[PDB]
UniProtKB/Swiss-Prot annotation, chain B:
Gene3D superfamilies: 2-enoyl-CoA Hydratase, Chain A, domain 1. This is ATP-dependent Clp protease proteolytic subunit. The lineage of its organism: Bacteria, Bacillati, Bacillota, Bacilli, Bacillales. Its EC number is 3.4.21.92. Pfam families: CLP_protease.
Swiss-Prot record, chain G:
Cleaves peptides in various proteins in a process that requires ATP hydrolysis. Has a chymotrypsin-like activity. Plays a major role in the degradation of misfolded proteins. It comes from Staphylococcus aureus (strain Mu3 / ATCC 700698). It is found in: Cytoplasm. The active site is at S89 (nucleophile), H114. The keyword Protease applies. This is ATP-dependent Clp protease proteolytic subunit. It catalyses: Hydrolysis of proteins to small peptides in the presence of ATP and magnesium. alpha-casein is the usual test substrate. In the absence of ATP, only oligopeptides shorter than five residues are hydrolyzed (such as succinyl-Leu-Tyr-|-NHMec, and Leu-Tyr-Leu-|-Tyr-Trp, in which cleavage of the -Tyr-|-Leu- and -Tyr-|-Trp bonds also occurs).
């Protein structure tokens, strides 16, 4: 049961202050919702910052790029904050936040790897599927290189296997700008 | 949950997608079945009734689906008076890319990292030889119907469409523009 | 998720789900497989609309693969019973009992959009158990076909003999071929 | 399967040149029958072989393995339908040596068009459709040759399930005699 | 069926009106997203007043737990923790994460601690990556648990090797809570 | 399933909560415990002096979830009356015995059952040992509290809870699980 | 029920006594091992006399097929290939692998040729490896099938893109077999 | 149906001429059988060569090492011949044949990769499983280095992913000695 | 299973070789126990050879094999080929003193016994006491045959402990590593 506040559900109350929740696996439904929220908020105010909360294991690459392109297209800066974890396409979207406004809390987990998929059937069908996922990885690595400041060659090497980063290591890597440390 | 948006009135609450429909935006954000087609067809009929002059905006993030359900949407877009803009965000595959190509001439768009896929229709038949023949003749005629309309809306020949849609053909937004499926790749606002 | 529409009136904002808004302008949706629930709803909508106005036309949207013959005949009989002319429009597809109901619209007011698909075939069914039980089931589905073909003959203008031959297997028709056959009156071309 | 003084019943029948087609026709059944036919040819090229048919048919290719082997070998292969011959089994019943195709009085003979399935792309469905259509043409041409009926008549008579009595099968040309007591 | 109280509040939403958040289930990303959003909502309402985290949980996801942990430490209000029924694993970790001097348990509440659980599959290098990750996760957990209990990291490692059930009184002695809240 | 009553419209159970009646009418899991614990905190905040009425028609369930309800009953100031209607089995009968002194009731044909706690253990011998020591502790914890509230000895409870022990309303009164059999007028 | 013949042989073991091997099922490793072992046994009995490989098979494992293929080529005796019923995929490859001039099909036998089928699942680089493997396997198959049919590699590529069913006579024209085996004289 | 050829089943006849079949996935049942055949054949004759046929996708590493150790323990040379395919522990055993007597037919497929496994439970239990499989890989890679003549660094890198090799490439790599060409 | 007339394992049994090459259940125990009794009846002085390629299994089934090895007069040699784990490693250690072997790459695993218990608290207690006694029984015997203390065996069997053949020899589970 998601609690009510007064009548907003808790997540709708957060959207009132320009906070969007990416708190699940990324499919087309999640992407359609977030994309729509981004369009609504920029229509309300094109100057004020938007805040993208990220607690996600990733998911669909095309659904992820739906969110990515909408972030870049709109005028407002979209801040990103990783709380809990950002894995796979979640960490890609974390790195896609406005330059200087990509954050994570100290114990947040960031993971990067190569895209996952499958193919079955004739040899030429397997080839088409293989060329597709390789082009998709090159596309992902190229953008990640541009937003982190790392070389495409280094991204390729570091995303070959599952690579778990602490929030601080994600800052060192260039996936975020600051680790949001708590007040004593 | 579908997020609720609330705006200060002289406080009115909307579900996000109904609020988008208020500004003439229709969401094609799922696999195309009869239910999705009926909704989109009804929305198109509602918006043209509200205003026959103002543009309609069809958001497309779909893997495609039913060809007949797709043609329900297609024919309704062609029948109504206002221009239907199409924008691919995320992906448009199969019937989804067909509907992307069906948007108003000069108003078919995609964001730079959107994926466009085209291929021949999928189906199945089972039973007697004459039943398989009927099913085969039907899906072949459906492909001719699709390819002929794609040729008209892209400028590509029916022979080239046949060859390019024989297997899965993935296109970038820029390649989709070059192919004639869209008119412009939308680049970021300043 | 059915989208909501918001109309401003002189009393205030009025919210409708999209399909209920269309019902306000006498548009009924047959947009699914025909079962008893779908027939019960459509039959009730027809009775509601004729009570509001017995002269005005009603519009039956048809995007259906067909389904139950008895549920189809619930809709058919209610269309013929009420005073209002029921226009039918095929958008997407009309197959089996869906195409039967497309042909059941008011004379001169049966439509299809250019790329809509119309299919006609003989009814489907099953029988299991004793020889006498299989006989009863076979006689029942055969009389149901004669019933369907007789009414389809009357509404298309085709003979019962020609309808029998043409519905022996799956027979897919274009919107123009459906017009030529007599299943619809006009193809509604775009302006 | 009982033993007889020591042979299993079907191996004893094979000793007297009798082959059992008593099940659905798959590749395993075809491989067995084809091998038995070749074996019986080597034992004696002159003496008749007797193919017992109680079968609902099955695989068309597996059926043609049996068909071609029957027409290839030197000995005449008598066919006898006991119980039923359907589809490919009734095709093989008709494949027996001219004048030596039989059925018992209450045996059931059924003929229909070949059954199959296709799934995937439109061009793949087209290929499967052209395949099964040409397979029917191949079956109907051979059935026309062996029954004496026209290809046009067989096409119409195999459109749906067509059940025949033993006497009707004789009149059709699927068999030569109804074997009385 | 959750009962309602009359504005109409479901019982949990009514408790949120008095700054009480419920952690009453297995910790997954949905529970974390909700609790994190409630913590942000309550500190926005008032940054001085105490928040009260009810804990009846068997634990669950370590990343989802750390989403709640970091959000507790980030916000200005003291987050009190009270164990009613049980707190195990990540739930007992979040119990120890409460404001200093404001971590409670009712007399018959059960507190359990152990090392984190997981799974690994595939190639030898993939298994190595999974093992190094879950070992770093335990070090990360034991470090924080050491600081908040006052026990040595060597002692935490030993006592979390197997399932270790503790009474409310034993949890106070261990440093997981501050007081056993006895009935007046 | 649940009917509405109008006066402000309430579902039947929410209307009962307005008169300080809490329903324990199902298997005791964490969700049921969380709900009841929240209702007890709501009612004591509304009025810390007026009685609360815990309806008990439960087969029991989770011991920790039961102890969530138990500890919340003992902590709050209001008297929590307990009334067994239908049945109170296992942890339900523990909570029936946990009601305010002199205000634990049962209707004449209500069923009260008591037994030892149920559980599981899998894996290594030391893991089984830890699991066995835990549930044995949990039983002592339950038996010690039952002893205090019933007036029966710990060793007597041990023997009487070894197997399933069904009791009538009158036998539950005689045992000390309830105070009165609430007879009809 | 495989019938016995009378020493008591099962029917297939009796056929092996006259140098006939049965490829009458889907090609898996078990079938390949048995056929490879039979081929080694028959060459040891007699290194000159022809072996007969009956083929009624829908194909199967490519590696299992190449176990059979390589053993045929390695041994001294000619392996006649005899298509009865049907030869599809790797079955039709093995049909084409029979001794030159001694590849047969019966008049109504079905021969089908198409590209190899497979699967890939996991990371992008794992999918790439699986794709490169099956593509190289196709080139290997096409190159050999080119050499034995007399058709160009690009013609084989085009004609095996989809399912391609050939009659016995069309298989002879294509070069997959040498003769449509006629009935024996009597 | 295994054909008959006294009357022997085909594989028993091959065993009479000292040919052992490794034609399936390597489990404990297959290893126990092959190990027993090796022990039987060396007892019949310690000097005459044994021939290990390999058409296997591999399987259990321990079951593979059962066969490996028995090959090295016995006096007779165990020839290895890859027909069809040798993958994983199957290709390890192909490389384990007598020096100069490891073969493959021209179109045989050879695959090498790192060992596969699983682990579940506590962090310390996962650690133990990780330490074990890594030791198993080093154990395997060291023997490959010795029998191929390649450096262990090269073996480590080349077995990181699935690495398919032709018969000629297997010869060049050192996994086999000759590609057995047809007469 | 190839033939040589004898099936391969029956031919090995003719030379007093018993195969423990599978998971240990009652059926495997009954077979091996019966082979041990049969081989004693054939010759009470000549050695028996127990091949061990097993992941272990039932402890009572393992103890059926153990007691029968100890009961009979002939020495029972044990050789680990492939792997011996759990009860398989226990039975490996139970072989005749000075005649317990393993090939170089053979794997030896030792760990505490696994079990399960469901129901009432007193039933869980009875199951827990039983498996604990079973561990004491196993550790006491493993102490006698390895030469290690009961405390060290308790420590080293708390978790999965994978040993090489040489490490198993050093531990006392075997006497010699058979070199080629
Ligand atoms: C940059 C937007 C450009 C300017 C353009 C457009 O091309 N679109 C397509 C579009 C649709 C759906 C979308 O994700 C759901 C879009 C996301 C990103 C970009 C375009 C999208 C429709 C858009 N509209 C609006 O935004 N109005 C404001 C009301 C928005 C809201 F949410 F409050 F109702 C209609 C008018 C218009 O011109 N546009
Ligand atoms: C336009 C086509 C012509 C004008 C005609 C018509 O033939 N029809 C059939 C129709 C039904 C359903 C449909 O998709 C659900 C139709 C879609 C496309 C075309 C026809 C469709 C009904 C139509 N109506 C309307 O459009 N009213 C306006 C109110 C619309 C809304 F949505 F707000 F209620 C009723 C009046 C009418 O004459 N028509
Ligand atoms: C022409 C119908 C005739 C006139 C008759 C009748 O025999 N019936 C049966 C009937 C029921 C349900 C039905 O589909 C749900 C019927 C459908 C078709 C015919 C009869 C049906 C009830 C009907 N009523 C009405 O029509 N009220 C008007 C208000 C209707 C609505 F929908 F707005 F509430 C009640 C009064 C009455 O006499 N009738
Ligand atoms: C001159 C006979 C045919 C045409 C010829 C031949 O081409 N083949 C191929 C063949 C194989 C399998 C077959 O169905 C299993 C065949 C079926 C039909 C035709 C050919 C077949 C092998 C055949 N053999 C025999 O017939 N030997 C006799 C022993 C038979 C048996 F069964 F007892 F062992 C070997 C010698 C030989 O020349 N042939
Ligand atoms: C300390 C918050 C910091 C200052 C900052 C921020 O960085 N965020 C990201 C964030 C998002 C989601 C979150 O858990 C759902 C966050 C949790 C913890 C920290 C940041 C989080 C958005 C935040 N906002 C607010 O809090 N406004 C008040 C309204 C809150 C509520 F809930 F009532 F609607 C927007 C303005 C702002 O500056 N911030
Ligand atoms: C009495 C306990 C003490 C006083 C303390 C407290 O420690 N807690 C923790 C607590 C949370 C959840 C609980 O079961 C859901 C608690 C149950 C028992 C004890 C504490 C619990 C919060 C409590 N609050 C209240 O009681 N407000 C009154 C409004 C309650 C309601 F329900 F109407 F909204 C907040 C203020 C406060 O100090 N407390
Ligand atoms: C011809 C190959 C060469 C000659 C060589 C050889 O390299 N091998 C490996 C081999 C094994 C298994 C095989 O398919 C199961 C082989 C298949 C093809 C090639 C080699 C094969 C063993 C072979 N043997 C025999 O052929 N003996 C004759 C007995 C045959 C039979 F079947 F009756 F028992 C042993 C002697 C020998 O030197 N060889
Ligand atoms: C080299 C083995 C050494 C010499 C020794 C030995 O230690 N063992 C253990 C052993 C068992 C099982 C095995 O794989 C099933 C063994 C495999 C490899 C090594 C030992 C094995 C028993 C062996 N025996 C034999 O060799 N018999 C000869 C006949 C065997 C056969 F197969 F023909 F029946 C008994 C005599 C003997 O001393 N040994
Ligand atoms: C040694 C035990 C003593 C000697 C005694 C005995 O008490 N028993 C019980 C027993 C049964 C089964 C067993 O594992 C299947 C036994 C195992 C171990 C001990 C006893 C066992 C039967 C035994 N027998 C034999 O040994 N016969 C010899 C033939 C044996 C074989 F295997 F070849 F057929 C019968 C005669 C006899 O007195 N005994």
């Amino acid at each position: 049961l998601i609690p009510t506040v007064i009548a907003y559900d808790i997540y709708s109350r957060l959207l009132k202050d320009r906070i969007i929740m990416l708190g699940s696996q990324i499919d087309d439904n999640v992407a359609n919702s977030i994309v729509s929220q981004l369009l609504f908020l920029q229509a309300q105010d094109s100057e004020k910052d938007i805040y993208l909360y990220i607690n996600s294991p990733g998911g669909s690459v095309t659904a992820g790029f739906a969110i990515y392109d909408t972030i870049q297209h709109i005028k407002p800066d979209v801040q990103t904050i990783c709380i809990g974890m950002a894995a796979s396409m979640g960490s890609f979207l974390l790195a896609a936040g406005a330059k200087g406004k990509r954050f994570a809390l100290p114990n947040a987990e960031v993971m990067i790897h190569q895209p996952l998929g499958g193919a079955q059937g004739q040899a030429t069908e397997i080839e088409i599927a293989a060329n597709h996922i390789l082009k998709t990885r090159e596309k992902l690595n190229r953008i990640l290189s541009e937003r982190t400041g790392q070389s495409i060659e280094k991204i390729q090497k570091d995303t070959d296997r599952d690579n778990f980063l602490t929030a601080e290591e994600a800052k060192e890597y260039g996936l975020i700008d600051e680790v949001m440390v708590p007040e004593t």
